[PDB]
Design a protein around this nucleic acid. Sequence first.
RNA 1: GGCCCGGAUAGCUCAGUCGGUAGAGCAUCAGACUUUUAAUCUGAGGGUCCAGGGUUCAAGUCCCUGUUCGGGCGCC
RNA 2: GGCCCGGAUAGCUCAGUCGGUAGAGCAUCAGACUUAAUCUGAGGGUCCAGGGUUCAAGUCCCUGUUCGGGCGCC
Lengths: 321, 367, 281, 281
Amino acid sequence: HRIRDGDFVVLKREDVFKAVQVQRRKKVTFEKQWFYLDNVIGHSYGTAFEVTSGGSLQPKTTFRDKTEFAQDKYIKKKKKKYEAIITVVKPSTRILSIMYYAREPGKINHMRYDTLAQMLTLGNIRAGNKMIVMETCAGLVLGAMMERMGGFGSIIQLYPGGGPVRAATACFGFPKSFLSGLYEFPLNKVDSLLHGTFSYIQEKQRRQEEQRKRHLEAAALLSERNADGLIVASRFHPTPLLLSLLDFVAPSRPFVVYCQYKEPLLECYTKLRERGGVINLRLSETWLRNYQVLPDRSHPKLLMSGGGGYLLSGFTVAMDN
Amino acid sequence: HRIRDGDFVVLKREDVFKAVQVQRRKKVTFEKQWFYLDNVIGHSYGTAFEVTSGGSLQPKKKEAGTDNRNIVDDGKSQKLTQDDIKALKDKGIKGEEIVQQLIENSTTFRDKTEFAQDKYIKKKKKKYEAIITVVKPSTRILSIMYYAREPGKINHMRYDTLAQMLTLGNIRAGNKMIVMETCAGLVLGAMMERMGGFGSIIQLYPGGGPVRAATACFGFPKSFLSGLYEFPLNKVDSLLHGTFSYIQEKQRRQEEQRKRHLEAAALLSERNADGLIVASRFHPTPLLLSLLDFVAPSRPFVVYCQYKEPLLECYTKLRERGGVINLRLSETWLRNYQVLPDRSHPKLLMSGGGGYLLSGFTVAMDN
Amino acid sequence: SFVAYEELIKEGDTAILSLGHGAMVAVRVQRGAQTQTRHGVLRHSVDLIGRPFGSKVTCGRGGWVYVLHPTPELWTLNLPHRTQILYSTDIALITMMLELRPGSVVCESGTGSGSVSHAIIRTIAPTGHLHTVEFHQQRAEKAREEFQEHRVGRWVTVRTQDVCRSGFGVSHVADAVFLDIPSPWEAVGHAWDALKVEGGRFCSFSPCIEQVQRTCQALAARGFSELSTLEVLPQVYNVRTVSLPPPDLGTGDTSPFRSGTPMKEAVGHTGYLTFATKTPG
Amino acid sequence: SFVAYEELIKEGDTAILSLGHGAMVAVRVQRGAQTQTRHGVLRHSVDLIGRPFGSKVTCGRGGWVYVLHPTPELWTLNLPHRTQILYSTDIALITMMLELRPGSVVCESGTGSGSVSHAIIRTIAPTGHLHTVEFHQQRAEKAREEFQEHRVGRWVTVRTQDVCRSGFGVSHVADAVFLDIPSPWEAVGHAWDALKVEGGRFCSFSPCIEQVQRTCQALAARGFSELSTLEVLPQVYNVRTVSLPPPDLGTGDTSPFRSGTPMKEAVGHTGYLTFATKTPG
RNA sequence: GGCCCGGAUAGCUCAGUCGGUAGAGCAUCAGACUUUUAAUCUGAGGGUCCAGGGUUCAAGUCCCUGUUCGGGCGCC
RNA sequence: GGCCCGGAUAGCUCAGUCGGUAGAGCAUCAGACUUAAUCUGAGGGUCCAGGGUUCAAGUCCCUGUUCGGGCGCC
Ligand SMILES: Nc1ncnc2c1ncn2[C@@H]1O[C@H](CSCC[C@H](N)C(=O)O)[C@@H](O)[C@H]1O
Ligand SMILES: Nc1ncnc2c1ncn2[C@@H]1O[C@H](CSCC[C@H](N)C(=O)O)[C@@H](O)[C@H]1O
Ligand code: NA
Ligand code: NA
C-alpha cells in the first residue's frame, strides 16, 4: 500500500523511467543527477519530488514576439530544463516494458511494449495456468506473465548458461507468494528429458543439492506433457526450440513465439505446417503510432514500426494415428 | 482541349475507374451497366453524367435524434416492399425521387443522428443517383485504376511507389532511358509523360513483343514515338560482347524490327545511357548485372520487386560487382484520410503490397 | 469455463470448431442437438460430449474436424456481432496500458457485444470484477445471457443505464475505466467519480479525431495526466513459397525463396486510443 | 547543368561529394577553391575540372572521393536549410498527383529553401514554367541567386508578396498549384484565379489536422471537386546478414539468412497532403 | 598567425568509404571450472546519445556559438 | 415439402480442412513453329441483388434470386 524500505520502485521525470531498490543510504543516479533514497519512505505512491543539495523534498529579452502557442512552447522547455520534477510510481508491466525498450532495448531484443501485450493476450495468460517460458529478455517477459497470473497457476522457466536471468523480474517487486509456482530447468537436458534418459565450502553443497532438487521437480512437471501454453522470445533460432518444446504442451492450448527478424519464423512456419498438430498459424506484426493533441496544433509525432519484431502464434492439436 | 471522337478517355463512378476509347456507336460495360459513347462527345472534360436506357444525359454538377439507445433492428423500419422498390425502378423514375421516397417511408430516419442521416443518404445516392464522370488520362489516374482493378498485371505496384520511381530515376526531358517492365507497358507510359516526347526510351521486352496496352490509354501523339525504341531481351548477352548480328507483310514487319532493332542495338553499344528502370515478374538480379553495363557513370537507377527477398541478393551481388553507390532499399507506406467535420479519420493504410524499391547511382570501375 | 481450462467437453459449454483456412464457428453444446458444417455432421451426444478439446472429431462422409477450448480471443472472432467490436489487437494494448490484473476492478461502457468484456474477465479472475454499462435495453440483456451461458456472472454486473448522466452506478471504487461510445467526453466527469480516490488509469477508444480533441480537452479539465494518444496497427502475413523465373538473355542464383506477404493490401483503421492517469493531487 | 546532363565537370557547376555512409555535401566549383573532407582535400583546379562525373578522385593523403552529377533529389539532401523542407518522399508523390509534365505552368508558395522549386523545374523543362511567391525578403533574394547560379532562371520567376492578400502574380495561366503555408485556406480563392479556366490541380502541405479541415471546407465552397487527402511515410532498410545461434539441448536448419532491418525504428511525421481538382462548372 | 572539415551517451575508453553508431572492450559482478592474495571459461548489471541559444506554422534527415579531442592545408 | 450449413465478381466457368477467392482455365487475340494444326505470351476483375442496422470504424443479421451439400419427417 504505502511506500516502505526495501520495496522496489520506478522513477519518472517526464517520459523517462529508471527502476531501483529502496535502501538506507544508497546513493543512485538519474538523468545525470545523484540522489539519496531515505526521505521517500513515508509517502504514498505517485508523490513528486525535487532534487536538493542532498536529500529529496516533497512539495505539493524578446519574449512577446512568439505567438500564443509558440510562446507557451518556448516557456515550457526553458522552465522544465532548469526546474525538473521527479515523481515516484509503483512498478508495472506497462512502465517497465516502455522503459526497457527505451533504456536497454538490446537486452530484450527490441521487443516493443505493444508487441509484448499481444503475447500476453494471444497466449491467454490468466489465473490458474501451467505455462512454459524460455526467454533472454532479462526476465521482463517472466515479469509480465506473473502480473497477469497473480500467484495463481505455475510457470516453468527454461534457461541456458549458468542460470536463469531475472533482473527486470525483481523490479516488479513480487511477494514471496509467487515464487512458489516458479521453477527452473536447464535447456541442455531437454533432449535427454524427451528421450526419458534424464537422471565456506559448505555453502555451495547446500545451494547445489537444493537447486538440483528443484530441477528434478520441474523435470517431472515437464514430463507430464500437459501444459496450458508456451511462450518463446530469445536471441536463439526459434525453429528448433518449438520442434522440441511443443511436445510438453497439451492439445487446444495457445503458443506465441517472438523474433526480432522475420526470416527465421518463415522457416519455423513451414517446419510446423510439415510437423503436425497445430492450427490457425498467424505470423503477425504490430505497428504503433503516438500522437500530439493540442488545440489547433494537433499532429502525429512518431510512427514506431519494424523494430517491434514479429510474432508467430497459434494453437495445438492432437496427432493422428 | 475539349472532348472529341476517337479520343482515349477514363471513366469514374465514386472511386472506381475504367479506361475506354470513344468509338462511334460502341457499347461498353462499367459497374454492371450498358452505355453508348455518342452522347458525351461535345462536352468539356470533367463532366458528370447519368444513365437512362442507353444514351447518357448530362445533369448538374432538420428533425434529427441524438442516441441509438432506443433503436432496435426490427427489419420493418422501412415500410415498402422488396417488390415495390422494383416497381418504382422499372417505372423509370428519376432516382432523386426514389431516395426521397425511401426517406419518407423510413419510420426511423427522423430519429437517427444527423450524421447517420447524412450517412444514410450518401449510401442511397451512391446506388440510385448513379453519377458517372469523365476524365482525361494521366499517369495519376491510370496507376490508381490498374492497382485497384488489375493489380495482378503490374505485379502489385502501388501508385505511390510508382511516383518514387519517376523521381529517384530523375526522369525528365532529354534523357536516354532504359526500361525493362512487364506491367502492361504502364511504366513505359509514366516515363513518356515525364519526357514529353523529348529524349529517348530503350525498352527491353521478353517473349515476342513489348506489352503496351496501358501505354495506349495515355493517347500520346505520334511525335513521342520517334524517340521510342525497342529491343528484344534475348540478344542482350550477345550485345555485350559484340556477338550480335503476304510474305511481304512478313518481310516488312520482320525487316522493320531488324531495321528498328539495329538502331536500338547501337544506342546501347554506346553504353552511355542516362538511367535504367526495372519492374517485372522476372528475377531482378540478372537483369541488373548486365543492363548496368549500358549506363554511363553517375546516372540513377531504380528496380521494383513485389517481394523483399530478391533485392537483398541484388544488394550483395552489386557490391561484388562494384561501381555503384547510395544503395537504398525503401518502401513507401500510404495512408489516405476522410475529412468531414467531427468526422475525420484514416481509411486504409496501404502497406507491404506496394512492393519495394532499390535505388542508387553508377560509378566507374577499378582498373 | 472461459475463466479456467477443463480437459473434457461438457454440456452447456461453448466450443469453437475450426473448419479450415482461418474460418471458424462457435457452438453451444446440448445433448441430442446437431450442427452442420462444410466437412460433415456432428452429433452433440457422441461426437462431442466427453471428448477432450483438440480431438480429430470424425463426422459425416469420412470428414473430421478439430475442436478448441474457448478463450476471449477466439470468442471475439466467432461471436454474434450485435454491434461493431474491437479485435484482439486493440484489446491487447488496452489491457496492458490500463495495468489490468487479477483482483482489479473495471468500468466499461458501452458493453456492446461483449468482445472487450470477455477479454477483461479472463485477466481479472478470480477476485476482480466488472461493472459494465449499456443504455440499450436489448444488448444489455443479451450480454447478461451470454455471461450466464458462459458461467461468468460472478465477475460482472450489467447496469442498464446512461453513463454520461448516471455514471457507472458506483463511486470511488474503480481501478481503471474504458470508453467505446460516440461521445466519451461527457463521461469524463463520471469516470473520475468512479475511479478510486487513490488513483487509476484511463482509456478512450474513438474512430474520429475530433472525438479525441474533445475527449482530451475534457480530460485536462477534470485533472487527468500523462495524456498519450496511441494508434495500433496490425499486419498479418500470408506465408507462401514463390519463384521468380530468370530472364532470357541468351545465356544457358535465381533460386526460389519463402516470403510473408500481407493479407489485405491495406490495413483498416480501428480507432484512436487515448490513455490517461488519475493521481491524487 | 541541372536540367540537362553533361559528361565533364565545368566551373560554375554544383557537384556533390560522397563521403561514405549516407553523408554527402554540395559544393560549387570555382577555380582556385579548396574543400576539406575527412578523407583529405580536393583542389578544384585539377581534381575536378575537365574530368568526368562519377570518377574516383584522390585527395592528397591517398584517400579518395566520388563525384556525382547534380539532381533535385541530391540537392534536397545537401541544400542550406533556411527553413524546414519537403523531402524526396513527399515530393515524388505530389509531382504525379498534380500531373506535372514538360510544358506545365505552375505556381508555388511559399518558396522557402527551394527544395520543391527545383524538383518542379526538372520535370516541366524545357517548355513549362513556374511562378513562385515568398513574402520574406531574404529567402526570396537567395532563391533568385541559386536559380541563376544553376542556370535555371529561364523556367522560373520569383515575386515578393503575400499570396493570401495579392495572389500568385498571374491569372488563369497555370495547370497546377502548390501550397506550404500556415494558412493555405486563405489562398484558396487566389489559387482558383491563378489556375487555367480549362481546369487544373491543387495541393496543400499542412501537418496540423485542424489546418486540413479548414482547407477542405474552403476548397469545396469555392467550387473545387475531387478532394482527397494523403500522407506518405518512407521506410528505409539496412541490409545486414545475420545468424541466430542454436540452443544446446545436449544434442552433440540453423542456416543463416539475409535480412533488411529498418534504419529508423520510428519514422517521423512530415505532414498531411491535400489535393483537389478544378473543372468548368 | 589563421582557415576549413569531422566526432562527444554506460563509472572509464572505443564502434571504418555497403546508408556498417542500441554494437562492443577494459573494469565490475555471478555461476561453472581448478591452477585459490587468484586465474581461466561462460554469462549478467550498466545506453535516451554533451552544454547554451536561433531560424523554420511543424523538425526524429538543420544552422550558429562555447567546452573537449582528432584530422588537414598554410600566413591567404 | 420442412430444418441447418456453404458459394456467386472477367463473355462463359472454376478456386483445395495452411502450397492465394486479385489466382487461374476455356474461349478470344497476337507472335513463335508449319499443313486450319501445334507451343509461348498478352488483353479481360472491385466480389449475385434489395432492405435494416454498428460510432461518426464494412460488421453483422434478415429477406429475395440462383447453384450445390447435409440431417431425415422435426
Ligand atoms: N452513453 C452511453 N452509455 C452506455 N452505453 C452507450 C452509450 N452510448 C453508446 N453506448 C453503447 O456503446 C456500444 C458501442 S459498440 C462497443 C462494443 C464493445 N466495446 C466490444 O467490442 O465488445 C453500443 O452498443 C451502444 O449501445
Ligand atoms: N502568407 C504567406 N505568403 C507568402 N509566403 C509565406 C506566407 N506565409 C509563410 N510564407 C513563407 O512560406 C515558407 C514556408 S517554408 C516552405 C518550404 C518549401 N515549400 C520547400 O519545401 O522547398 C516560409 O519560409 C515563409 O517565409
Ligand atoms: Na565519457
Ligand atoms: Na460468371
